[PDB]
Symmetry: C3
Subunit: 235 residues, 3 copies
């Protein structure tokens, strides 16, 4: 039972569960949701209790993307230029992607556009069989492709990323699993149990070493092997 918080947060045994909680809107991303998760993520980094972070959706869908109704209100009347959704989303994507704790995305349902980009910023992705994935061209709209064009080619290769972006069809959890979009697929009934077990052994490990390792993985993409070895001879 929710208390109208935009983001339901619970911390159990070193695992911080951050669940999007607008199930009626399929957990559509709006500025209140963006900012709330953005501030709660900063609290998780500083908190010594949390050693792993889970990002999940409520109800049938993980996240349907940007809230078109909120965008409509700014567009239809008043300040469309003062609407700061893109600024709030890009700050959130950057922080989650570089978070110093191990992060897991529990794709309980469909992830679309910015909703899929939110899962791609996590280190791991476990998806339910019902989960469906949409990006770029939807058939009726075109999602923001900033983070998709950065994440998708790195996880899927260039061609596979262009099939998902340019074609309007959604990908199933099986197809996402086979293409490398998600790392693991479980039945929807066992998803919360599967994520908890996976996040538990992540939480049992040395969080400090994971933080340094996660920074080396990210920094290593832009430097040669010799540079990477030089950089690790320092701290």
């Amino acid at each position: 039972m929710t208390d109208l918080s935009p983001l339901q947060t619970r911390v159990e045994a070193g695992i911080a569960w951050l669940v999007l909680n607008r199930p009626q809107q399929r957990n559509a991303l709006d500025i209140p949701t963006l900012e709330a998760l953005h501030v709660r993520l900063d609290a998780c980094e500083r908190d010594p209790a949390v050693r792993a972070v889970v990002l999940g959706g409520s109800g049938r869908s993980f996240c349907a993307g940007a809230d078109l109704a909120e965008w409509a209100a700014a567009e239809a009347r008043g300040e469309l230029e003062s609407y700061g959704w893109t600024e709030a989303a890009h700050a959130l994507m950057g922080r989650l992607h570089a978070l110093d704790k191990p992060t897991v995305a529990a794709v309980n349902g469909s992830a679309v556009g910015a909703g899929m980009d939110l899962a791609l910023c996590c280190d791991f992705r476990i998806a339910a069989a019902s989960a469906r994935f949409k990006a770029g061209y939807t058939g009726m709209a075109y999602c923001p492709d900033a983070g998709a064009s950065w994440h998708l080619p790195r996880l899927l290769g260039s061609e596979a990323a262009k099939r998902l972006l340019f074609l309007d069809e959604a990908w199933s959890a099986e197809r996402a699993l086979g293409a490398g979009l998600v790392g693991e697929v479980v039945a929807d009934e066992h998803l919360v149990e599967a994520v908890g077990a996976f996040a538990a052994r992540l939480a049992s490990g040395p969080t400090f070493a994971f933080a340094q390792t996660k920074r080396l993985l990210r920094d290593g993409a832009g430097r040669s092997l010799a540079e990477q070895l030089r950089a690790e001879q320092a701290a």
Copy 2:
């Protein structure tokens, strides 16, 4: 029935078909072919009618690579230094790879060396079952490895790319499909039909959004996620 054009071009329903047309030479690449496709590609970018581009071969083979006979004539007598094949090929590879329209390579037959590099510059690759792929060491010769050494590790991973380049064996369409070299494999009888259907739904989508997305995919490979998000807050 051909009209001696080095490149047979037809535009149907927003799809520009560019077919190499030297079937006797297995569509070997020479300066006339390089330049013709090079100029026709520039016309496709500017043309609002074309919304997808197909690159195919004639007869049994997609492209056997550089025309050794043309190179022999320049080598055997006269100006081997004035031979500008490498300059014409590198200009073509760069333009095709960065083309602002969705590009599909219909690998109707074997692609060797620069012929394979021509297909790698396309966004998508659909191959017939008869198609065979050769790169680097052939057993009797060594193909230009400039574009291969750039494309192959990005599509196949380092080791798989080195197996194809250092070993003289050709890869089948099945092996190319499994390694990520091509995205789809169909029977040779259904190849033209399969490419047309795939290029049709690409042509039905928003071409303008694909152009911006294709530029973001390419630019995103050289910058971090935070930089990519900064860059997309501008146009």
Copy 3:
């Protein structure tokens, strides 16, 4: 029968076999082993006889990683700061990774930490079915992650590399094969025979062209396609 050399070296038919030879320590890496392989590798580059290089382990294991006993002696008494193991290892990893000859890693047994990093610096990896792979968190210790954080995401993708580093479980030869960690898996009884046959056809090819190609593959990762083509119009 060994002669107490830290590294057993034999050169047959253009193939230089470099076998770690401390089977009692599971071929644990210490400064004498690091330096010996480091100097022998430099001899292989200069030697025109060797056209392919094989790196193997002795006995049951390929390499168990850094020698903890040697580190203990420096730590327990005397000069832990003067201990130059990291410096010797990083010089070895850099040279092997950029070696001008084709290199093959014969993973005869388990490779752990720096031992796995040694195989990742080779161009090819053929593993026995008994081979097991450990990286990062072991359950009781945490291996150096400098080269792992550089190699593993490039071979396995980000998520798969983080599963191997953050989870303490080892990967089997089958799982390593399926994830792209090794290129080929054979029975332990046929490993030496399989590596010899693979290294033989590598040794039969044009070694000079492989050297230029191997440099282009490595340099191409940091530049665009247009830059790569500009660079190959020169030597």
